[PDB]
Nucleic acid binder design. Structure first.
Lengths: 121, 123
RNA sequence: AGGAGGUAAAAAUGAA
RNA sequence: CGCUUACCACUUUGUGAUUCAUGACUGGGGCGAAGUCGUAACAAGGUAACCGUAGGGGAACCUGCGGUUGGAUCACCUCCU
RNA sequence: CGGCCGCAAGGUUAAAACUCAAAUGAAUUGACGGGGGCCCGCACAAGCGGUGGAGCAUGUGGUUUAAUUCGAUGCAACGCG
RNA sequence: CCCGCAGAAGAAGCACCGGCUAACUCCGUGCCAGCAGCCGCGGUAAUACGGAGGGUGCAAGCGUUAAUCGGAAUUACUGGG
RNA sequence: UAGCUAGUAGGUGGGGUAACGGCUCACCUAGGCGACGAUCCCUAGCUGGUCUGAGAGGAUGACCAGCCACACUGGAACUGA
């Protein structure tokens, strides 16, 4: 399988097409809806990135290297580092607003309300 | 007390620190405003107030609060900045002038329009 | 009334 | 008139002094929310706390030495002139 | 940061940026304490009989459906209305 | 400067109204949008948010921002610990 | 910012200018300045006054007036009262 961090990409979901421009020129593709856990295929389909196709088959070409071992390896480096580029939607945003701490601060608002009945004639 | 020491070393004077470090005595400054985003105020209150970072002509890069019900601010949009903090947002000490050069007035404002720079409808 | 020894056991949190 | 001498601005060089900007990376601090673990302090806070100092540890902090009180606690039971 | 001293750990003199509208002191009424004192109570002790182990009735939570109506839902709701 | 002609004809806005601080109701949105010099306001009866009407103040100016002194006996010589 | 200066402290003589003087030379003397702050670094035109303030003070020195300094940067001289 293609090694990634958590979804880990089960190989068989990669389209590596070898062409000439030598068989070393690979035009690698990757499917955007490959079982990726809900929000993952959400951030991999849509992108404000480069090398991103509108059909979710991301376009990368393996040139500049004559050795076929390296072309396969360099394309992998431009996938995991690329997947980090798409998992970084504003570095840390979901952004998850807690729902129970909100009732705590609202209680504190009423706590100040109870003490705001001071001084007056 | 010791007035003898007073003639050796005089009475001091505190540092007149200003709450608005925009520039020395400049009522307003021109900013090229970058990063128009939003944030949450501090603990006792809650909202998603619109804010924006800015860069003055002198070189300072501070934040500015965009008041009003809606805004026309975009990525660059050169604006004008005045003093005054909001107390709810931790880290902002500048109000943006609603109505100046690149900032339009708030939509449909009848009461209090000088502030928010809305033109009086003669029609 | 002065004065001498002496008798006590593990156990968090409620969210800044 | 021309020639020649000293003083000199500027320039070049070497050479340090000082300060302003800038710097991959890194340190500690403030602020914001309180999600992770823990629960140190306030009652004797469940091992009294704190100060100085050294060591140790994921964290509050723990331990040794000396000091201070900004510490609590003298309740009952067998006994004698 | 710099100066000075120190073998070293550091010591001494000594800022600002930034951020908050509070921090703090004594004392007062209560509250609470794995603080103390006096006193009470099927609180426990000394004893009797039950639940939870079985079947069934009833109520609630949950679940399925077109409905499985609403409220109550630590003690002080759950054969309650 | 003075006189005459002449139709009231050509000429009023701006901030604020919870308290500090003179001055109120209603509608809409419901810790959302937003308000704010200080404390704070808002979870479907908001006098504080937006609108409407009325009102308070000043007035061809009215408000925000910036700066100075005073209030500040918060550098106290006058006048502190 | 703790020591600073070596025509630098002074004397004699020559020279020099409208005029006194290390203003400038030769020789000799070894002093001068400094904690009531010398030197160093930073900031700044000064005053009459302006504004505030009960006053003492504090901020400030644009406009009117007086003084000083500069004329693109720096150096020198001439002409001339």
């Amino acid at each position: 399988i293609v090694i990634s961090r958590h979804v880990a990409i089960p190989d068989g979901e990669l389209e590596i097409t070898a062409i000439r421009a030598s068989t070393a020129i690979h035009l690698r593709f990757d499917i955007r809806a490959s079982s990726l856990p809900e929000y993952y295929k959400e951030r991999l389909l849509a992108a404000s990135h480069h090398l991103i196709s509108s059909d979710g088959v991301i376009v990368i070409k393996a040139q500049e290297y004559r050795s076929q071992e390296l072309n396969r390896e360099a394309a992998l480096a431009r996938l995991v580092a690329m997947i980090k580029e798409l998992t970084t939607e504003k570095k840390a945003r979901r952004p998850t607003r807690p729902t129970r701490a909100s009732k705590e601060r609202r209680l504190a608002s009423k706590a100040q309300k109870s003490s705001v009945k001071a001084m007056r004639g | 007390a010791t007035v003898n020491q007073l003639v050796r070393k005089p009475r001091a004077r505190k540092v007149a620190k200003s709450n608005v470090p925009a520039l020395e005595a400049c009522p307003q400054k021109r900013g090229v405003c970058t990063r128009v985003y939003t944030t949450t105020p501090k603990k006792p209150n809650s909202a998603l107030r619109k804010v924006c970072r800015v860069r003055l002509t002198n070189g300072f890069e501070v934040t500015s609060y965009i008041g009003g019900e809606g805004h026309n601010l975009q990525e660059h949009s050169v604006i004008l900045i005045r003093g005054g903090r909001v107390k709810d947002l931790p880290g902002v000490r500048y109000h943006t002038v609603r109505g100046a050069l690149d900032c339009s007035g708030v939509k449909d404002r009848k009461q209090a329009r000088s502030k928010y720079g809305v033109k009086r409808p003669k029609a």
